Amino acid sequence: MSLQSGSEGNSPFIREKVMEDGYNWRKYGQKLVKGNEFVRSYYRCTHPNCKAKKQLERSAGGQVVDTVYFGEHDHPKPL
Template identity: 55%
Template sequence: MEDRCQVLFPCSSSAHHGLSAAQTTTSTLSQHNSNEEEEEKHKSRKKKEREPRFAFQTRSQVDILDDGYRWRKYGQKAVKNNPFPRSYYKCTQEGCRVKKQVQRLSGDEGVVVTTYQGVHTHPVDKPSDNFHHILTQMHIFPSF
């Protein structure tokens, strides 16, 4: 608060430090201007748009369902209140930013919940009859 006092009303305390009122005001104003520039940088940043999410449940004995795309697993973690881990995958097609999460339901271990984030920018790598079966059983849930 004393810095603002020096800008608006140069106090005698600046004389004790060997600075004139003009020097104190100039240095404090330059600090104030740099703070304003930082604030403008933050304001000009656009909010990151969230990719659309699609979740569906499938009754399956296997966790990995063949949906016609190629995936690379990049992580797995334990989830609170669920004995089954959640697995994280990224589409391997160059430039495609789609991700998916796969997890079994805690209440019914025969059901796999798959959540896709984003939309593929390329055609299906290998069409699959199983993929048609998945789409017919798909239940779309709102975003989390």
């Protein structure tokens, strides 16, 4: 059950407890690796003046096997 969900402590959303568009994320793009069998997706913070980036790895059947997050946010919620 944990593997299916809650596998990664660091997630884009917390307890889905969002007041309303608290965080703005924009899909960086999509890239296929080793054929359509393996694919990768890049995500970056929509908010300007932000170097925070997020990378998600998905393979046949979607699902995430590896999540990478780099950068810090000075605005936890919308201003």
